[PDB]
Amino acid sequence: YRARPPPRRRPGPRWPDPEDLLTPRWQLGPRY
Amino acid sequence: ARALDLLRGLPRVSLANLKPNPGSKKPERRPRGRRRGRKCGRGHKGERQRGTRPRLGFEGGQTPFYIRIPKYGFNEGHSFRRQYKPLSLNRLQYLIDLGRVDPSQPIDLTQLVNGRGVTIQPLKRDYGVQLVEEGADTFTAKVNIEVQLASELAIAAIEKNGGVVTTAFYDPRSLDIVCKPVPFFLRGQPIPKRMLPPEELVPYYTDAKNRGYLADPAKFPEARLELARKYGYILPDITKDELFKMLCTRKDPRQIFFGLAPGWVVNMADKKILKPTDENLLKYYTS
Amino acid sequence: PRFVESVDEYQFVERLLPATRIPDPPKHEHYPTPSGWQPPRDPPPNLPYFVRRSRMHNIPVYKDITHGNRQMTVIRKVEGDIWALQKDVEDFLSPLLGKTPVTQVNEVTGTLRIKGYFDQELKAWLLEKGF
Amino acid sequence: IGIRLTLPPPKVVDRWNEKRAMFGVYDNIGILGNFEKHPKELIRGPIWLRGWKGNELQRCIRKRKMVGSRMFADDLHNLNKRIRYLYKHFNRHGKFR
Amino acid sequence: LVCPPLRSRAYTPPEDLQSRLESYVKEVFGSSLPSNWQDISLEDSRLKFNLLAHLADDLGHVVPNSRLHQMCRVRDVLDFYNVPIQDRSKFDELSASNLPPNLKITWSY
Amino acid sequence: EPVLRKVELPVPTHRRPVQAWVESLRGFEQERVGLADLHPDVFATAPRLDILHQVAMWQKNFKRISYAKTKTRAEVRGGGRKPWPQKGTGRARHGSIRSPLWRGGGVAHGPRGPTSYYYMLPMKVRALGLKVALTVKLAQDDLHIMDSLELPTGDPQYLTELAHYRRWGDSVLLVDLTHEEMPQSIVEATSRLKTFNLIPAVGLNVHSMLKHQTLVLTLPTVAFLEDKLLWQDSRYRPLYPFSLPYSDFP
Ligand SMILES: [Mg+2]
Ligand SMILES: [Mg+2]
Ligand SMILES: [Mg+2]
Ligand SMILES: [Mg+2]
Ligand SMILES: [Mg+2]
Ligand SMILES: [Mg+2]
Ligand SMILES: [Mg+2]
Ligand SMILES: [Mg+2]
C-alpha cells in the first residue's frame, strides 16, 4: 500500500477568519 | 563481531522473540488471594485502613513540630534576593581547549550560552554569572570575557595573561533575550534597550576596581597597577599586540550587541534588517 | 510609519547564532593540554577491546551514589572483549586495596561497576594506555 | 451457569489490512524529517488531551478549564462533584501521611 | 515476463575449486605480483565486487549480506566456500538417516 | 555497470565499515549490482532487545487513548432517597440505590473517561532504537538495498515471484526518500496488494520493519537516515526544540 501523505505544517502563514468566534482573539491581535 | 555472528545463525527476531531486560519491569502485586487479600496491608482496625487518618505532621492534638518552632528571617524576599550562577576559569580554560568558543573573537554571555558552558534560567531570577577564583593556576586564555560579577583573583589572573574583564548589567527581560535571542527574532519586534542597574547595585557597577562599565577608563590603569602591585605579577601593556582593538571592543549602555542596537528589527526568512527612520522613534531608542 | 532596510549587518547575526555539532578541538602544539585534557592516541593500540571517548571527547568514566552508601564508579561503553579490560583494572586496583576487586560487568551494555571512587586513577590509566 | 454450551463463531483475524499494515508509521517524523513537526500533534483524539498525561484529577481539571464552557450542564455538574470527591480523597484518604 | 526455475539453496563444493578461484584471482590482479596470495586484501569495493560477482554466477552460491563485510581477505572466502551447505526439510533428512525399524515419523501436509 | 557508494561521514579508526550488496528491479535475474559500505556504529550496534521492547511498544502505547467509562453511583440516575428506616425492618442497612452492591449500580473502581497513556522516550533512546533495528536486519540478512524502485512491467504477479525467487520473505517494506518521487509503476503495484507495503523515509519506524519479515532501502535513503542518526550520535546539547532554525542545521 502507498502510505498516507506525510503530515506537514501549513505552508505560509495561518490567517484565521476575524468574524469567527471559535477562533481565539490572540490570533487577531497584532502580536500574532 | 562475536555478537553479530550469533544472530545470523540464530532465528529472525519478531514480536514473539521479544523480551525486556530482566529486572526492569517488576510484576504488579494486587491484593487478591490468601496472602494479601485478607487485609491488603492496611492494618487490623483503625484510621490506617478506614482512611480517616489526620494530615501529615499531626501529633494527635499535641502541637506539631512545625508550629512550636518560632519564625525567623531565613528566606524572606527570596523571590527578590540577589542570585548569580557560578563560572570557574578552570572551565573557561577547558572550553577554549575544546574549541567551542573561539578566543580570537570577544567572548560574551551569548557566545557562552551558545557554547552551552552553563545553563541560565532568567525567569528563576539570575541576572547573569560570576567569575570564581577556583582555577587561578593553568590559565592562559587571553580572552575579552564579558561577565556580570567578578572576583579579584579572576581579574588579576585574566589581566596577567593579557585578557580583559568587564561587568555589564542586564534586566530580566533584557537578559533572557541576550541568552537566547533567536525566538524574539521569530517575533519581529525591535530588540529592547538595556537599563541602568537597580537602586542598590549602582555603586558596584560605577566602581573602577570591579571593572564597572559606568566607571571611567582613566581609572582602570590605576586598578590594574594596584592588582599587579598586589599579587606580584608583571603588568603586560596590551597596546602592543595586533588585536588590541578586539580586546577593547565594548558595548555602551542601552545596547545589547556590538553590531545591533535598540530599535533595529531583524528578519531571517528573506533576511532583512530594518530601521524606524522616524525622529520620535529613533531619538528614544538612543535614550 | 517608515522603514529602511540594510543587509550588511547580517554577519553579526551569524556570529551570534549557535552551532549544532561539537567542533573537533584545535590541534594544540603542546600536550598534555591544560585542565587535564588529552585526546586519544592515533592509530589506536591493537587490542581485544577499545574504549571510545564521549561527545565532548572525554573519558567515559563516571561516578554514582545509591542507597546513600553504594559509593561506586562506572564505565559505560566497553567495546570488544570486556573480560580482558575488567581483568586489567582488577590487577591494577588489586595492590591499592590489598584484595582482588569483586566488581560487576555487563557485556550487553558493555559497562563496568566498581566499588569506590577511582575515576582519577582510571582516567590516568586509560590516558597513558591511549584510549 | 456462566459458560456457554456451544462454541462461539471463529473470529477471523485479518493481520494485514490498512490499519495494521500502516501501523506505527510517521511516529519518527521529528527524528528524520528535519523536525518540521512533533509526533504529538499526529494523534487523533479529544482536545483536552493531545500529547499529555494525567490522572483522574489532572484530566478533569484540564477538561473543565479548556472545554468546560462547551460541556453540558449535567456533565459539568457531575464533573465538579467528581473532582470534589477526588480532591478530598487523594488529600485525606489513603496511606503515606 | 517469464520466471525460470528457482535455484536450490543447497550447494556442495566441487573438487579443485582452489585452482578455479586462483586462476581468476590471477585474471583480476594482469598477474599476482606478490607471493603468498592468500593474505591479499580487498579494501577496494571494485576488486571485492568483481571477485565475489564472478564466484557467485560461476559456482551458484551467493555470500549473504551478513558475511561479505567479514570476508576481508581471500582465505576467509576460501573457508566460506570449502564448507558445504544443505537444504532439505527435517522430515527429509530424518527419513534419509538410518532410522531403526521401530521408529517412524510422518508428515501430515 | 557497478554502482558504489563510499561513506561521506567520518568513521572511527578502530571500526571499519561493513559492505552490503545492491540490487534493482529493472530486470528479474539482476542481483548483486553495486556495493555500499556502511557506518559500523549504526549498523553494528549490540542486539539490545530491551531497547526494541521499549521503543516498539512505546509507539504501540502513546498513540493509544482509551474511551471506556463507567457511571459512578452519583452519575447513575436516581438513588437520592433512602428506600427504607434504619431499625424499622429486618432488611440490611442501604443508604440509597445505585451503590456498587445494587443491581445496575455504578462501579466503585472502574474505567474513568478517555485516559491517556502518552509518554515520550528520550530522543537518543528512540534514535538508538532505530540504529539497532536495521542493524539486526543486517546480521540476519533481512534487509536489501537497491538503486531505485522502477520496473517496466509493474504488476503484483511480477513483484511476488521476484520476492520468493530471491527468497526475501512473506512480508516486505519499501522505502523512499520523499512522497513525490515514487514511480507510478511500483506504487500502483503496492496499492493493489497488501504485504509488500510502501512507506517514505520519514515514516520509517522499527515496528513496521520488525512486523514485516524483510526491508528495502534506496541509496538516497541510506544516506538520509545515516546523516540523521549519526547527527544524533554527534549531536549538540539541545537548549530548545529543533523546529527553530540553526546555523548549520536547517
Ligand atoms: Mg485499634
Ligand atoms: Mg474488621
Ligand atoms: Mg475524621
Ligand atoms: Mg545514578
Ligand atoms: Mg445522586
Ligand atoms: Mg436527599
Ligand atoms: Mg448516606
Ligand atoms: Mg450501569
Swiss-Prot record, chain A:
* Record region (Disordered): 1-22
Q: What induces it?
A: Down-regulated by p53/TP53 in apoptotic cells.
Q: Where is the composition biased (Basic residues)?
A: 1-12
Localization of this protein: Mitochondrion; Nucleus
**Expression sites by tissue:** Widely expressed. Highly expressed in the thyroid gland, heart, lymph nodes, trachea and adrenal tissues. Expressed at lower level in liver skeletal muscle, kidney, pancreas, testis, ovary and stomach. Barely detectable in adrenal adenoma and papillary thyroid cancer.
Subunit info? Component of the mitochondrial large ribosomal subunit (mt-LSU). Mature mammalian 55S mitochondrial ribosomes consist of a small (28S) and a large (39S) subunit. The 28S small subunit contains a 12S ribosomal RNA (12S mt-rRNA) and 30 different proteins. The 39S large subunit contains a 16S rRNA (16S mt-rRNA), a copy of mitochondrial valine transfer RNA (mt-tRNA(Val)), which plays an integral structural role, and 52 different proteins. Interacts with GADD45A, GADD45B and GADD45G. Interacts with NR4A1 via the NR4A1 AB domain. Interacts with ATAD3A and ATAD3B.
- Family named by the database record: Belongs to the mitochondrion-specific ribosomal protein mL64 family.
State the remark under miscellaneous. Answer: Cells overexpressing GADD45GIP1 were more likely to be in G1 and less likely to be in S phase and grow more slowly than control cells. Inhibiting the expression of GADD45GIP1 promotes cell cycle progression.
Protein name as catalogued: Large ribosomal subunit protein mL64
Source organism (scientific name):
Homo sapiens (Human)
Gene that this polypeptide is encoded by:
GADD45GIP1
From Swiss-Prot, chain B:
Instruction: Cite the record's Basic residues compositional bias ranges.
Output: 27-43
Query: Keyword Methyltransferase, does the record have it?
Result: no
According to its UniProt record, what is one Pfam family this protein matches? Answer: Ribosomal_L27A
- Map out region (Disordered) in residue numbers: 13-57
**Stored InterPro entries:** Ribosomal_uL15 (IPR030878), Ribosomal_uL15/eL18 (IPR021131), Ribosomal_uL15/eL18_sf (IPR036227), Ribosomal_uL15_bac-type (IPR005749)
The UniProt entry, under PANTHER family, shows:
50S RIBOSOMAL PROTEIN L15 (PTHR12934), LARGE RIBOSOMAL SUBUNIT PROTEIN UL15M (PTHR12934:SF11)
Q: Does the keyword Glycosyltransferase apply?
A: no
* Major localisation: mitochondrion
Would you tell me the protein name for this molecule?
Answer: Large ribosomal subunit protein uL15m
Q: Which UniProt keywords apply?
A: Mitochondrion, Ribonucleoprotein, Ribosomal protein, Transit peptide
Residue intervals passing through the bilayer: none
GO annotation, cellular component aspect: mitochondrial inner membrane; mitochondrial large ribosomal subunit; mitochondrion
Q: Which organism is it from?
A: Homo sapiens (Human)
Q: Which GO terms describe its biological process?
A: cellular response to leukemia inhibitory factor; mitochondrial translation
Q: Which GO terms describe its molecular function?
A: RNA binding; structural constituent of ribosome
User: What family is this protein classified in?
Assistant: Belongs to the universal ribosomal protein uL15 family.
Q: Which gene encodes it?
A: MRPL15
State its location(s): Mitochondrion
How the protein assembles, per its UniProt entry? Component of the mitochondrial large ribosomal subunit (mt-LSU). Mature mammalian 55S mitochondrial ribosomes consist of a small (28S) and a large (39S) subunit. The 28S small subunit contains a 12S ribosomal RNA (12S mt-rRNA) and 30 different proteins. The 39S large subunit contains a 16S rRNA (16S mt-rRNA), a copy of mitochondrial valine transfer RNA (mt-tRNA(Val)), which plays an integral structural role, and 52 different proteins.
From Swiss-Prot, chain E:
Q: Which UniProt keywords apply?
A: Mitochondrion, Ribonucleoprotein, Ribosomal protein
Chief subcellular location equals: mitochondrion
Could you state one GO biological process linked to this protein?
mitochondrial translation
Tell me where in or outside the cell this protein is found. Mitochondrion
Please give the GO cellular component terms listed in this UniProt entry: cytosol; mitochondrial inner membrane; mitochondrial large ribosomal subunit; mitochondrion
Q: What name is this protein filed under?
A: Large ribosomal subunit protein mL50
Taxonomic source organism = Homo sapiens
What domain of life does the UniProt record list for this protein's source? Eukaryota
**Homology family:** Belongs to the mitochondrion-specific ribosomal protein mL50 family.
Q: Indicate the quaternary assembly.
A: Component of the mitochondrial large ribosomal subunit (mt-LSU). Mature mammalian 55S mitochondrial ribosomes consist of a small (28S) and a large (39S) subunit. The 28S small subunit contains a 12S ribosomal RNA (12S mt-rRNA) and 30 different proteins. The 39S large subunit contains a 16S rRNA (16S mt-rRNA), a copy of mitochondrial valine transfer RNA (mt-tRNA(Val)), which plays an integral structural role, and 52 different proteins.
From Swiss-Prot, chain F:
The UniProt keyword set, sorted, is: Methylation, Mitochondrion, Ribonucleoprotein, Ribosomal protein
Region span, Disordered: 74-105
One GO molecular function term of this record is: RNA binding
Asked if Lipid biosynthesis is a keyword of the record, the answer is no
Cellular localisation = Mitochondrion
Q: Which residues carry this modification: Omega-N-methylarginine?
A: 103
Signal peptide residues on this chain, from the entry's feature table:
none
> From which domain of life does this come?
Eukaryota
Keyword Lipid metabolism in record? no
| Annotated GO CC locations | mitochondrial inner membrane; mitochondrial large ribosomal subunit; mitochondrion
List this protein's GO terms for biological process: mitochondrial translation
Q: Where does this chain mainly localize?
A: mitochondrion
What is the annotated quaternary arrangement, including any partners?
A: Component of the mitochondrial large ribosomal subunit (mt-LSU). Mature mammalian 55S mitochondrial ribosomes consist of a small (28S) and a large (39S) subunit. The 28S small subunit contains a 12S ribosomal RNA (12S mt-rRNA) and 30 different proteins. The 39S large subunit contains a 16S rRNA (16S mt-rRNA), a copy of mitochondrial valine transfer RNA (mt-tRNA(Val)), which plays an integral structural role, and 52 different proteins. Interacts with MIEF1 upstream open reading frame protein.
Write out the similarity annotation. Answer: Belongs to the universal ribosomal protein uL4 family.
**What protein am I looking at?**
Large ribosomal subunit protein uL4m
From the broadest rank down, the organism's phylogenetic lineage runs: Eukaryota, Metazoa, Chordata, Craniata, Vertebrata
What is the covered span of the full protein?
45 to 294 of 311
